[PDB]
Amino acid sequence: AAIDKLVKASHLIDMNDIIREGNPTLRKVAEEVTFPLSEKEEILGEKMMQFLKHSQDPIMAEKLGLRGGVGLAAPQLDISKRIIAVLVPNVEDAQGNPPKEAYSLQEVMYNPKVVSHSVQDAALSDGEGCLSVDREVPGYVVRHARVTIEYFDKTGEKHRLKLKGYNSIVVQHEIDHIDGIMFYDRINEKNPFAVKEGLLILE
Ligand SMILES: [Zn+2]
Ligand SMILES: [Zn+2]
Ligand SMILES: [Zn+2]
Ligand SMILES: [Zn+2]
Ligand SMILES: [Zn+2]
Ligand SMILES: [Zn+2]
Ligand SMILES: [Zn+2]
Ligand SMILES: [Zn+2]
């Protein structure tokens, strides 16, 4: 099964492991994971984070042929489980100093959900890209500006977190995968760049 292939100790996730638009797995509602986690589910999360770290590293990305990512969802690996990884780096200053914190968000989340959110909407100015979609897709992907999420970590510990900005967008994008929703579902059908008043456009 897919999962067996992915959790092999020597196996590194690459783009040949990522399923693409058209595969039905991407449209299902993924199954909740139960605790305590199986070994496979723990390992899968670790491999998914490793994939993100590799995608962000100029060397490994080039070694393995990776498109950069800041989030990955298990359905994109053909695994219909509610497991996401997110890895959002902070940036250097103009002087080339590293940020105080490497990342603004770094988590492998089990059973994540949005529990509340702002009335306000937001969208990335640059639109969204998807590792599973090999097409140019223009437009504003209209999301909640701010969200409160719940999720469990690999140990079974429950977290409750509020997010805003880019990090809010990322998490939402990944939770959508485990509900079978694609980014372009949230692009206006008639004018991809329509702006309803009060939409927060994030640069
Ligand atoms: Zn592989
Ligand atoms: Zn482990
Ligand atoms: Zn590595
Ligand atoms: Zn709650
Ligand atoms: Zn609501
Ligand atoms: Zn995605
Ligand atoms: Zn929502
Ligand atoms: Zn459409």
Residue numbers in the entry: 2 to 204
Sentences from the paper on this structure:
PDFs are ubiquitous essential metalloenzymes which co-translationally remove the formyl group carried by the initiator methionine in bacteria, mitochondria and chloroplast. Here, we present and characterize a PDF enzyme issued from the bacterium Streptococcus agalactiae (SaPDF) which behaves as an excellent structural platform to describe PDF-inhibitor interactions. Like most other PDFs, SaPDF behaves as a monomer and its crystal structure reveals a classical PDF fold. In addition, SaPDF contains the typical insertions of type 2 PDFs12, including an eight-amino acids loop folded as an α-helix (insertion 2) and a long loop connecting strands β2 and β3 usually referred as the CD-loop (insertion 3).
The ligand binding site is localized at the interface between the N and the C sub-domains, as evidenced by the structures of the complexes between SaPDF and synthetic tripeptides. Crystal-soaking experiments were conducted with formylated peptides (Fo-Met-Ala-Ser and Fo-Met-Ala-Arg) but led to deformylated molecules in the crystal structures as previously reported for other PDFs2627. This is due to the ability of the enzyme to deformylate formylated substrates in the crystal packing. Peptides, which therefore represent deformylation reaction products, were found bonded to SaPDF through a high number of non-covalent interactions, which are similar to those found previously with Escherichia coli PDF (EcPDF). Indeed, the free N-terminal amine group coordinated catalytic ion and was hydrogen bonded to the catalytic residue Glu175. The hydrophobic methionine side chain fitted into a deep hydrophobic S1’ pocket composed of several conserved residues (Val71, Leu125, Glu129, Tyr167, Val171, His174). Finally, peptides were in a conformation mimicking a β-strand which was hydrogen-bonded with the main backbone peptide bond of Gly130 from conserved motif II (E129GCLS133), Val71 from conserved motif I (G70VGLAAPQ77), and Gly69 which preceds motif I, linking the two β-sheets from N- and C-terminal sub-domains.
